[PDB]
Write a protein that binds this ligand. Structure first.
Ligand SMILES: [Cl-]
Ligand SMILES: [Cl-]
Ligand SMILES: [Zn+2]
Ligand SMILES: [Zn+2]
Lengths: 30, 21, 30, 21, 30, 21, 30, 21, 30, 21, 30, 21
């Protein structure tokens, strides 16, 4: 797994791929 | 939050996974 | 219809852009 | 859900926004 | 809508999605 | 330009829309 | 043929990369 | 337009460049 | 099946995210 | 290759990882 | 071609598009 | 490497192409 800073849309894509069918929750306010 | 944890700091696949449903 | 997996990638990017600080939940099959 | 409506048919940002929290 | 810096390809994607069928114009020289 | 306005500074959906055809 | 909306997203990213400082217009149906 | 040619068939960066300004 | 070109774009992003510092080779048709 | 398996069927990050170096 | 810094997934996408059928090799450790 | 060359510094299409198979 990348060992770098994941920000903005990149973090959301990482969440999308890692979570899969489990789905995810994203709040930029934290 | 996932931002301070993964954007402001570097996080692992496991850490990213703590934010799944 | 299209490949749902690829489409989803684009949907989450759109949610990131439009929702902003309100955050959002991504749940494929509620 | 958003997949059900926006993957078969094209959704504007307005339609996508309906799915925000 | 995100209240953050939109740069590079991210700005172009934002333009693509916001403008839709209207299409857009992109010049990095400004 | 949209860069100085949206990349060098933060802009709104409305501001981004000023650059549509 | 493919979903034109998704394809378009990839096309604008390609235009951003290749055109550079020359900028470009994206007009789906002239 | 670029959609008309590059969404049905695969376009190299060279073909995409044809559409630059 | 889907448009292989678009799919590939998403595959390389996934490889970038998951492989990390191990890097990877992307060879469509070995 | 990865295209052969992951473009027809959906691959988890685990399946994609199989293709890392 | 863009005359800007290409990093992370953006570099990988640039590699994907520029290399085409030739395929590419990516190692972040350099 | 392509990073120090294209990310830490600005590189050309030709330079990016040196990293193709
Ligand atoms: Cl970035
Ligand atoms: Cl796609
Ligand atoms: Zn980025
Ligand atoms: Zn796509």
């Amino acid at each position: 797994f990348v060992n770098q800073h994941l920000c903005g849309s990149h973090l959301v894509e990482a969440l999308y791929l890692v979570c899969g069918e489990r789905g995810f929750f994203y709040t930029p306010k934290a | 939050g996932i931002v301070e944890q993964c954007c402001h700091s570097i996080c692992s696949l496991y850490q990213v996974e703590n934010y799944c449903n």
